């Protein structure tokens, strides 16, 4: 079956570097404004990007692009009577499918899936990707560093244009969380104060603060991170290390930190923040928790996206159980873990002092 | 809905880039070494990777690259977990007979060069005349492979080797070649093709045509003769001709050229064969569909012009440049043999 098989293994390469074309191109975002249930082809939506307006083969180049988006269900596909009623009518309406309507940013926040999935596809990320043999063959490589000569947050401080697409692919993506996390867990209520420990450029602890205004927010990162971070009501910037000091914090969150670290690094962190809590504070772990038997479900391939990621971008990263979280917390001298389920593998996982 | 939606999305990078690891890493063939109907642990696979031997960490690693595969239907897995086969990872074993496997025109279309340009794809929208490739680059993809050897290697064989499994489908349906004594094939890469026609048609001399770059590196193949040129110049006179993948790389008028320069190199009663993956009226989530739209993808990324086309559109070529007479001969999954006749 090899001209069967031509199709469903070529397409891998192709489906994703179309769809950063229409995210690029903001296709989806366009189609949106057509309206609810709105179908649209390609020369109509062309006509809204002003940067093709003197390229007449503008749409037929979209067109190539979208349809095989629709192909593969990103975009549903359709026609009209007055279309089909000696003329070839090349030009199918193209509508927003569940996936694609995540690609298109909210009208009141901008929002969406768009800035996480343009890091995981950016080129920094893709060049790992092309180094990523390396870890099976070679002891202690990582292929980020064989791709770029340099680990992933010290190459962020070097690379202005890494740094933002990294820091606003982690921030939009967190505001999504915590959405989910805010229907589901009331752990912060009762809090005064909360330490974001690889906070990123603050947002989460932004909107943490925004949700319940009786917490002092800080927010830690490194200075690179910290240099580019905006000012957010409630939200307190610290820059620093984690694996050297933590500030002192009656509470603290790591969400999408321990898993870029291997088990002695999370030690190492946590035994930090332990040091920096009083009797009875608590840190907070946010992560894609890997389920226990993997299988074709959300869940699990929330976690093992994350998890090839790490493989690729920084030494020792990986997702991990329940369990696994559970013995990292222990060894940093935690009791009392609570995991809290919130939707699709996304857990908050208690450890408490 | 967007924690669901995000495992349906951010997995779309990942697949492609853990079945090119995989592939470089021969883990398909390792499986099947075991037996083709072999289920083996990660562990089992690398201990087959000699550079895998003072790694304790690498079955780990290894195991989290399979079980995203067996996750997407690429391998099977069953209770380390245990992998095998599927039907698309049979197609990724090089055959014991000779070696060949989609492998290398996998690895060509997944290839830095090809993902490169694949990041310049919205510049075709924006701005009229673009090339992704070139905005890459720097240079059109026939000038880059004269200056980059690896990328030459890369393309050629990854040509190569997909041609003999077009033509193993090619010879279970379409009879044409019998009878004829000459065949040049324009555009014929390393001469693959040709080698293969001849073998299995021992009364056809057989001429392959292609850049110098391409026929410099190409094999000696018993009943080939290589010739240099640039087809867009002329073409040789030959008795019968064939454009395989040649097409489908250029626009509407250096097509037109180039099927002239053929009718100009043809004797009366002559013949050009085309063969491509012809688009469908419709298109769906099926092979047919998806045959044509990766090369259009692919060449819309790589080559000013370039495009898949359908049945009318190749006759409305071939008309132009003064063929008579077109027989469209489906062969499988949308690959078609498509008769000019002078
Ligand atoms: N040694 C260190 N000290 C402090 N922050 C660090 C660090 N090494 C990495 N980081 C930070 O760890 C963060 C991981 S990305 C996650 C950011 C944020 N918590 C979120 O969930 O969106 C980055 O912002 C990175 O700069
Ligand atoms: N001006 C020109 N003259 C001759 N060959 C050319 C050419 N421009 C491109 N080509 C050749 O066109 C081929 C396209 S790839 C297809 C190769 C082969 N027919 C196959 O089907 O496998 C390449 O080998 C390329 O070098
Ligand atoms: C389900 O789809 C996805 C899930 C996740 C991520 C991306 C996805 O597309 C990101 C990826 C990522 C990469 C690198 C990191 O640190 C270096 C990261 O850590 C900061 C992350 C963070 N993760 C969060 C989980
Ligand atoms: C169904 O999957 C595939 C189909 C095809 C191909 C690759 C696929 O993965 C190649 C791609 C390709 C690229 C560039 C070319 O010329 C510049 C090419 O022409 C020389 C080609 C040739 N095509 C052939 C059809």
Redesign the pocket.
């Known amino acids: 079956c090899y001209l069967s098989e031509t199709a469903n293994l070529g397409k891998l390469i192709c489906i994703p570097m179309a769809l950063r074309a229409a995210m690029e191109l903001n296709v989806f975002q366009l189609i949106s404004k057509f309206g609810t249930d709105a179908k649209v082809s390609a020369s109509e939506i062309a006509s809204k990007m002003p940067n093709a307006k003197n390229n007449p083969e503008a749409a037929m180049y979209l067109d190539r692009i979208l349809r095989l988006l629709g192909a593969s269900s990103i975009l549903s596909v359709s026609t009209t009577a007055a279309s089909i009623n000696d003329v070839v009518v090349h030009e199918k309406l193209y509508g927003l499918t569940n996936s694609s309507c995540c690609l298109v940013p909210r009208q009141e926040d901008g929002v969406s899936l768009v800035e996480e999935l343009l890091f995981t596809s950016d080129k920094v990320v893709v060049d790992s990707f092309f180094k990523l043999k390396c870890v099976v063959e070679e002891k202690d490589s990582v292929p980020f560093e064989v791709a770029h000569g340099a680990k992933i947050?010290e190459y962020?401080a070097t690379e202005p244009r890494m740094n933002q697409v990294?820091?606003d692919g982690?921030?939009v993506?967190?505001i999504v969380?915590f959405e989910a996390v805010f229907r589901v867990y009331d752990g912060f209520l009762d809090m005064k104060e909360l330490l974001?420990?690889?906070?990123?450029?603050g947002?989460?602890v932004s909107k943490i603060v925004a949700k319940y205004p009786l917490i002092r927010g800080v927010n830690?990162?490194?200075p690179?991170?910290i240099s580019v971070a905006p000012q957010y009501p409630g939200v307190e910037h610290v820059a620093?290390?984690?694996?050297?000091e933590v500030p002192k914090g009656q509470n603290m969150?790591?969400?999408?930190?321990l898993h870029?670290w291997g088990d002695e690094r999370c030690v190492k962190l946590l035994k930090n923040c332990w040091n920096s809590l009083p009797v009875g504070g608590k840190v907070l772990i946010?992560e894609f928790v890997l389920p226990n038997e993997l299988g074709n479900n959300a869940e699990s391939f929330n976690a093992l996206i994350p998890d090839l990621l790490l493989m690729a971008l920084n030494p020792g990263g990986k997702e991990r159980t329940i369990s696994e979280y559970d013995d990292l917390g222990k060894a940093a001298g935690f009791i009392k873990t609570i995991p809290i389920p919130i939707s699709n593998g996304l857990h908050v996982i208690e450890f408490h002092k």
């Open positions: 947050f962020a990294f820091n982690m921030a993506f967190s969380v974001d420990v690889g906070g990123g450029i947002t989460s830690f990162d490194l690179h991170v620093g290390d984690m694996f050297e969150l790591l969400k999408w930190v870029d946010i």
